[PDB]
Write a protein that binds this ligand. Structure first.
Ligand SMILES: CC(C)S(=O)(=O)N[C@H]1Cc2ccc(-c3ccc(F)nc3)cc2C1
Ligand SMILES: N[C@@H](CCC(=O)O)C(=O)O
Ligand SMILES: N[C@@H](CCC(=O)O)C(=O)O
Lengths: 260, 255
């Protein structure tokens, strides 16, 4: 039986480098929610696997010109990986080229501010120009704003797409740093999951504000026609019903809380 | 061909319109799932007939005979082509039918009559004065039957042996039971239905504690159905276009 190649992404607390990683080899180098999730899926489906960090560090989007897929989605599409186990958002354009399991975690787009920033909603952001705001590149949040027909979000997109200097970031960490070092002059649009995690990390200077802008989920992805599709889906449902997914959420978000 | 849609009378998902007795076909009904069925059919390009599940149940497999009842049964035995309803995605069901990606989230929750001294599932388990139960033939009952979590397992032990029965045939009967029992009955039901009842007259019930689990409702089809993929894509499109949120706001929030 062949070793399953898992594509994932370095995104805290989903996949993180272990303290002693320089001593370690293979899967032992990593820890986090998706590392634990990969182990559980593999156990239930009965396969051996190798965790591999996506080469370009991206989630996945299709270039409007070339129509080529990048990120983890690209790795599945082009045969470079057998499965993605990551905070990968279930979307229509992605479901057209890969398969997703039932969602293992719920999330919505949300707003991160530096504490004390005079903003409490997306409407607030759209009605002013003093505080800049942006999203991650090559992900579902950027596509959300690009495609939205809702007035407030369309207004936000029109601003973001032409903002100078660029309001878009290559990694979540870059977005977080920009909030922290901009004296309240930058707000970051990101998924509630990542937002809530950062909010509980030192130096405890960020805050989630307003309601989630949408309601969606992360799913485990496989290339079309994969023999792993059905087993993985059943595994996710079993893990959900056994309470394992809730246990892993508490382990990596709330048991780790640093902000009291 | 006309697609046969099985559904269930459950407010505000599917309800009889006023003066429904002189109405016919799909026009008899209104609600979130009625609107959803219309949207799915438009995006998938099929004509349909809404039908209320014959036995009024969601779907459970008999332990003895292994026969499925409810909407699940109707799909399994070919009596309906698709189920569009607040039907919970579960492992045992996913083994016999297919579910779309979920169109709505929910968790098991507690309904009390206002003033009932109960804050949580643990409160219910550590007392005997206030009775409590679930819907029969649904995912909530199965949840307690299967749980290995101490609090929930203790609640199951009590409920399965309670006399008279604490289980209701319909959600409405569970709600009416809470309302008529002077605080001596609590009801375990999905957060979605709980939250709907909370905002209706006589405003005498409320949801207490956090949800016991996290799951979703999906559109269900019999295995091998040509509707499976189109329906899934329709749900995702409706999600991303904001239609699902609009429908939720229309039927819940529009005490
Ligand atoms: C594995 C089962 C528990 S699940 O398939 O029900 N997944 C959970 C996790 C999860 C995540 C997202 C959504 C959701 C809800 C509404 C919407 F529009 N889009 C997505 C539902 C659920 C239920
Ligand atoms: N989870 C997103 C990435 C994060 C974001 O776009 O905010 C995706 O799969 O594209
Ligand atoms: N949504 C449930 C019915 C309601 C309940 O069990 O509380 C099901 O599909 O079985």
């Amino acid at each position: 039986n062949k070793t399953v190649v898992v594509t994932t992404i370095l995104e805290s607390p989903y996949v993180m480098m272990k303290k002693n990683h320089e001593m370690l080899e293979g899967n032992e180098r990593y820890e986090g929610y998706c590392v634990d999730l990969a182990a559980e899926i593999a156990k239930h489906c009965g396969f051996k696997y190798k965790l591999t960090i996506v080469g370009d560090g991206k989630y996945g989007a299709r270039d409007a010109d070339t129509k080529i897929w990048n990120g983890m989605v690209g790795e599945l599409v082009y045969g470079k990986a057998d499965i993605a186990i990551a905070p990968l958002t279930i979307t229509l354009v992605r479901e057209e080229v890969i398969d997703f399991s039932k969602p293992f975690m719920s999330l919505g787009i949300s707003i991160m501010i530096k504490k004390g920033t005079p903003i409490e909603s997306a409407e607030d952001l759209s009605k002013q120009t003093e505080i800049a705001y942006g999203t991650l590149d090559s992900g579902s949040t950027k596509e959300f704003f690009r495609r939205s027909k809702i007035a407030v979000f369309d207004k936000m997109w029109t601003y973001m797409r032409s903002a100078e200097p660029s309001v878009f970031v290559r990694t979540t960490a870059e977005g977080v740093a920009r909030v922290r070092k901009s004296k309240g002059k930058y707000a970051y649009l990101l998924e509630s999951t990542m937002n809530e995690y950062i909010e509980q990390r030192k130096p405890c200077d960020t805050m989630k504000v307003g309601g989630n802008l949408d309601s969606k989920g992360y799913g485990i992805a496989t290339p079309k026609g994969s023999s792993l599709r059905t087993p993985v889906n059943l595994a996710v449902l079993k893990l959900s019903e056994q309470g394992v997914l809730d246990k892993l959420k508490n382990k990596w978000w709330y048991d780790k809380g640093e902000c009291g």
